[PDB]
Design an enzyme around this catalytic site. Structure first.
Site, PDB file in Angstrom:
ATOM      1  N   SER A 119     -14.329   6.171  27.806  1.00 47.58           N
ATOM      2  CA  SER A 119     -15.468   5.487  27.269  1.00 47.58           C
ATOM      3  C   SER A 119     -14.904   4.897  25.821  1.00 47.58           C
ATOM      4  CB  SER A 119     -16.472   6.262  26.629  1.00 47.58           C
ATOM      5  OG  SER A 119     -17.712   5.788  26.403  1.00 47.58           O
ATOM      6  N   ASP A 290     -18.752  -1.036  24.436  1.00 45.88           N
ATOM      7  CA  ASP A 290     -17.848   0.031  24.639  1.00 45.88           C
ATOM      8  C   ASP A 290     -16.777   0.018  25.846  1.00 45.88           C
ATOM      9  OD1 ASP A 290     -19.359   1.028  26.718  1.00 45.88           O
ATOM     10  OD2 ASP A 290     -19.046   3.056  25.938  1.00 45.88           O
ATOM     11  N   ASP A 292     -16.186   1.360  28.614  1.00 44.79           N
ATOM     12  CA  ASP A 292     -16.454   1.409  29.938  1.00 44.79           C
ATOM     13  C   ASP A 292     -17.807   0.574  30.124  1.00 44.79           C
ATOM     14  OD1 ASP A 292     -17.764   3.504  28.611  1.00 44.79           O
ATOM     15  OD2 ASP A 292     -18.155   4.643  30.434  1.00 44.79           O
ATOM     16  N   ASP A 294     -21.183   0.838  29.170  1.00 43.90           N
ATOM     17  CA  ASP A 294     -22.416   1.483  29.036  1.00 43.90           C
ATOM     18  C   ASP A 294     -23.019   1.628  27.613  1.00 43.90           C
ATOM     19  OD1 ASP A 294     -20.965   3.848  28.304  1.00 43.90           O
ATOM     20  OD2 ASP A 294     -21.937   4.987  29.240  1.00 43.90           O
ATOM     21  N   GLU A 378     -31.091   4.973  23.385  1.00 49.25           N
ATOM     22  CA  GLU A 378     -30.574   6.083  22.663  1.00 49.25           C
ATOM     23  C   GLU A 378     -30.242   5.377  21.173  1.00 49.25           C
ATOM     24  OE1 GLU A 378     -27.417   7.323  24.967  1.00 49.25           O
ATOM     25  OE2 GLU A 378     -28.549   8.862  25.939  1.00 49.25           O
ATOM     26  N   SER A 380     -27.699   5.894  19.910  1.00 46.35           N
ATOM     27  CA  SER A 380     -25.877   5.607  19.937  1.00 46.35           C
ATOM     28  C   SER A 380     -25.778   4.508  20.630  1.00 46.35           C
ATOM     29  CB  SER A 380     -25.396   6.896  20.320  1.00 46.35           C
ATOM     30  OG  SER A 380     -25.994   7.415  21.563  1.00 46.35           O
ATOM     31  N   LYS A 391     -26.089   4.105  31.705  1.00 41.70           N
ATOM     32  CA  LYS A 391     -26.532   2.860  30.911  1.00 41.70           C
ATOM     33  C   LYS A 391     -25.867   1.831  31.269  1.00 41.70           C
ATOM     34  CE  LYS A 391     -25.739   5.649  27.524  1.00 41.70           C
ATOM     35  NZ  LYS A 391     -25.153   6.925  28.185  1.00 41.70           N
TER      36      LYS A 391
HETATM   37 MG   LIG Z   1     -19.257   4.426  27.277  1.00 39.14          MG
END
Ligand SMILES: [Mg+2]
Length: 561
Positions: A119, A290, A292, A294, A378, A380, A391
């Site tokens: 991630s 980010d 990956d 999501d 979220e 975050s 996500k």
């Molecule tokens: Mg990620």
């Protein structure tokens, strides 16, 4: 060399291969210098699949492009083949975003997938590596399965592998491998990294409207920063090639094995380059993803920051700008408990159920599978819908673009209008990193005891002139309405009568304290003030009641978001 042998390799188990909720993550060096470390773990995953079901099974495999990814994919092919897995579907060059994997699993009815990503953690020769397992609903493997994987990994004594099997990850199509003394072949399908995911988005959104929004002289001007990670080709092929955004719209959209030497983690400082670009005032909309794909950060003109808690609220308040929700209807809204209460204001007004869940995907996934959840967020930098079971950062961007197209206002004007309509939830998260565990634990234990006293509800905290009154104070617990599990000790909540909250969590090399401050304001003379000024009174109250400084020696958080 299209015909390969199966061998059994004696191995020695490791003791720390826990798959967790987001995958097994270790230093790249660990995977490289620890004999059969990756092999053991991949075998342990495949061993959870019943032998009788392996031939008819497909696993989806791909990752975020970081260093060691392709070597791990080759290893997955070699072991899957030897174990009797009938097919892998692999993104070209090994590249699949985490949302694309979820998409493909659900589309082709795969038994699951293995995602090579850590991630937002750094990658490269000196970076991190992760191996994530998803199951047949396209989402993260649940605890019962990750528990089994871990247990197998701890006592594994051998694994099966085709050492001479090699996949060409660079070329599209079907590659067949005939296994010595096996009747049925092993099949690998290399697919374009973007196509299935783009075809999904083409159905969800109105690409005609978006192309009109993004093309020509009167276009909405955008800057989309993939932070040298997996979403790069998705931006280029969808936003630029298909929807006609000028090529300069795609920022850092070539995947790099070290993400350019930086953490692919979207926030104001990690994506400082994007922020500085937006500050020039030339573009209407900016976003960062980010590693990956999501997670997402949303920016407006001049670098106006849409905080993630507000972002999901604005999407909820304009949700029928998106064709998908016009068709499904809104089945429910949800946010993690520490996320601001902005979404709940929209849910209350529109009379849609609001689910407040503990931190973690499984709670959202459960509700979606029950047809009770359309949109989740979220604090975050996470936003998603039940279109898949992860996500989806680029999805969130196209949601925002759809809303901009129907509203015909700036990002900032939409937020000001939103705050005027629903009130504003001023929000910040304070991270105290690597604090001594003893002090942090004592801080939490002492605060919880304080909150549990009968007299604590009704206690008043002056600001001054302004008085905050405690309405409710507890250690958050959640009974899952789908799987019946009870999650306890999920965070200390101080809930005030005016709609505001203070929340403390200990993170799951020293502890991390996360302090969330959610200050609700309805007054016109307040909703457009500086957030750190409006949050100062509740921050002061939080630090005093918890005695954080006294327990940890910290006079300031490590990070403020
Ligand atoms: Mg990620």
């Amino acid at each position: 060399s299209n015909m390969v042998k199966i061998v059994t390799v004696k191995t020695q188990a490791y003791q720390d291969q826990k798959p967790g909720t987001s995958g097994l993550r270790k230093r790249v060096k660990v995977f490289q210098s620890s004999a059969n470390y990756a092999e053991n773990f991949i075998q342990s995953i495949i061993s959870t699949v019943e032998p009788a079901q392996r031939q008819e099974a497909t696993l989806v495999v791909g990752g975020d492009g970081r260093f060691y990814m392709k070597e791990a994919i080759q290893l997955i092919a070699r072991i899957a083949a030897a174990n009797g897995i009938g097919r892998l579907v692999i993104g070209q060059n090994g590249i699949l975003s985490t949302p694309a994997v979820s998409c493909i699993i659900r589309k082709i009815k795969a038994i699951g997938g293995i995602i090579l990503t850590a991630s937002h953690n750094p990658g490269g020769p000196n970076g991190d590596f992760g191996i994530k397992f998803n199951i047949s609903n396209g989402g993260p493997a649940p605890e019962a399965i990750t528990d089994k994987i871990f247990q197998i990994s701890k006592t594994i004594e051998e694994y099966a592998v085709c050492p001479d099997l090699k996949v060409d990850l660079g070329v599209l199509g079907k590659q067949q491998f005939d296994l010595e003394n096996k009747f049925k072949p092993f099949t690998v399908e290399i697919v374009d990294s973007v196509e299935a995911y783009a075809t999904m988005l083409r159905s969800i959104f109105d690409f005609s409207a978006l192309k009109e929004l993004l093309s020509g002289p009167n276009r909405l001007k955008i800057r989309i920063d993939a932070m040298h990670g997996v979403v790069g080709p998705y931006v280029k092929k969808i936003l630029c090639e298909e929807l006609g955004a000028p090529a300069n719209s795609a920022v850092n959209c070539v995947p790099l094995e070290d993400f350019g030497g930086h953490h692919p983690d979207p926030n104001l400082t990690y994506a400082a380059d994007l922020v500085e670009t937006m500050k020039s005032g030339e573009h209407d909309f900016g976003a960062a993803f980010d590693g990956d794909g999501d997670r997402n950060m949303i920016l407006g003109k001049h670098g106006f920051f849409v905080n993630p808690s507000d972002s999901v609220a604005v999407i909820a308040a304009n949700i029928f700008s998106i064709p998908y929700f016009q068709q499904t209807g809104v089945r429910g809204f949800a946010r993690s408990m520490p996320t601001s209460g902005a979404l709940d204001r929209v849910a209350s007004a529109t009379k849609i159920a609001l689910y407040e869940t503990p931190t973690g995907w499984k709670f959202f996934g459960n509700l979606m599978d029950a047809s009770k959840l359309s949109l989740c967020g979220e604090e975050s930098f996470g936003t998603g819908s039940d279109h898949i079971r992860e996500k989806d950062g680029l999805w969130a961007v196209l949601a925002w673009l759809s809303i901009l197209a129907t509203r015909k206002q700036s990002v900032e004007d939409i937020l000001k209008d939103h705050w005027q309509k629903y009130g504003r939830n001023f929000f910040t998260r304070y991270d105290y990193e690597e604090v001594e565990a003893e002090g942090a634990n004592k801080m939490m234990k002492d605060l919880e005891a304080l909150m549990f006293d009968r007299s604590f509800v009704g206690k008043q905290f002056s600001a001054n002139d302004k008085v905050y009154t405690v309405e409710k104070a507890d250690n958050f617990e959640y009974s899952d309405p789908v799987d019946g599990s009870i999650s306890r000790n999920q965070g200390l909540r101080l809930i005030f009568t005016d709609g505001s909250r203070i929340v403390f969590r200990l993170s799951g090399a020293g502890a991390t304290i996360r302090l969330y401050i959610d200050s609700y304001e309805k007054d016109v003379a307040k909703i457009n003030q500086d957030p750190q000024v409006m949050l100062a009174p509740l921050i002061s109250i939080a630090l005093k009641v918890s005695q954080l400084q006294e327990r940890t020696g910290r006079t300031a958080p490590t990070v403020i978001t």
